[PDB]
């Protein structure tokens, strides 16, 4: 059998920061979504435009698996139609999203005593991201009319900020690993079938 390598996304030992979210393009394989119905492993499993229980009966042109880490209380922003720092400046789903959003608590892997400062999010950006846009700029953010010329100072801020993930955080503020499955159906032969 030629199974789609969803394990490489879901079971990756390390995850990306949300501003630099990872994407794996899945093509030309048999997709077995049975691992999703294994509950007690996922705190969020929400689908849009498809039935969550019928995924094994569906064919798509391609499937995208995006993955990243955010705060628990930010998982609600990974949905069509949402606003907030994550949806606006880090990872944006389209209003007409077709796919599923899966999340689980990763406190045991992604928090550190005194703070894990490796997971970042973009705090400053002049405009919202388009759906599925990925901004990895580290340009100094100009909050006034004076050019920054690459140096931080008043009105001149580094645009990325660290999460302060420590294992004693309240659960809503603990790290969550998120995988977004986008199902792409083009006027073309399907290559990912259940």
């Amino acid at each position: 059998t030629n199974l789609c390598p969803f394990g490489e996304v879901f079971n990756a030992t390390r995850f990306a920061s949300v501003y630099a979210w990872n994407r794996k393009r899945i093509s030309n394989c048999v997709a077995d979504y049975s691992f999703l119905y294994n509950s007690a492993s996922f705190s969020t499993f929400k689908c849009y435009g498809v039935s969550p229980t019928k995924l094994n009966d569906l064919c798509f042109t391609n499937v995208y698996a995006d993955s990243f880490v955010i705060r628990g209380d930010e998982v609600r922003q990974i949905a069509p139609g949402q606003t907030g720092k994550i949806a606006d400046y880090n990872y944006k789903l389209p209003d007409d999203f077709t796919g599923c959003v899966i999340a689980w608590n990763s406190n045991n892997l992604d928090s550190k005593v005194g703070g894990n400062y490796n997971y970042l999010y973009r705090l400053f950006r002049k405009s919202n991201l388009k759906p599925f846009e990925r901004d990895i700029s580290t340009e100094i953010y100009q909050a006034g009319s004076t050019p920054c010329n690459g140096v931080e100072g008043f009105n001149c801020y580094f645009p990325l900020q660290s999460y302060g993930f420590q294992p004693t955080n309240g659960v809503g503020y603990q790290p969550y690993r998120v995988v977004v499955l986008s199902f792409e159906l083009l006027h073309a032969p399907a290559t990912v079938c259940g």
Partner: antibody
Amino acid sequence: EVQLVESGGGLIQPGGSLRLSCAASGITVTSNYMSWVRQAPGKGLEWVSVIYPGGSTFYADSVKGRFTISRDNSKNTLYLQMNSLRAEDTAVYYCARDLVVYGMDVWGQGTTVTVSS
Amino acid sequence: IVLTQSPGTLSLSPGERATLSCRASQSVSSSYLAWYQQKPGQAPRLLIYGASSRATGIPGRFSGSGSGTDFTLTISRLEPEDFAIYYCQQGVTFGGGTKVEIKR
């Protein structure tokens, strides 16, 4: 100089409307998280509303559906439209630039709103 | 998120050390807190951001510390202009304030 100059407060009857303005110099309003914070007589500070640099807006539950935050880039000004005002909206209203991780560093001088019949 | 400041009133003399407490109902991020001073008729003034970083131009006698849920503002040696109300802040939440008044 870096300042926020507020205006628009005054006396209004319950159910009426007022518009507060916060004219900025030294920061670009549309490039910032900009907030309104109010303080009722003798009480503490209460966050009221924020507008993000990209335009998303958020409101305290106590003003949702009644207040609208907005901005005008050409005037470099932040606004708060307050509709269906109530007695308990009586307060000094402050605008402030919010750096989120670096605190609210720049504050307006405050404008007083008194809602009474 | 609820921020609880203690005590409600500190009664101290000039030259004495002031210690003000802010406790958060939840551990959020790390060192996630700002401190403000407010005098009658004036707007609040940022003292401390990121729990421990002094805002520009704030005198060195002001220091902040703490993490998780327990945070402290210290005024190492009170000056007469330091008698005032002090607020902590996290996100959209403010503490209830602590008044520093002159003891006699």
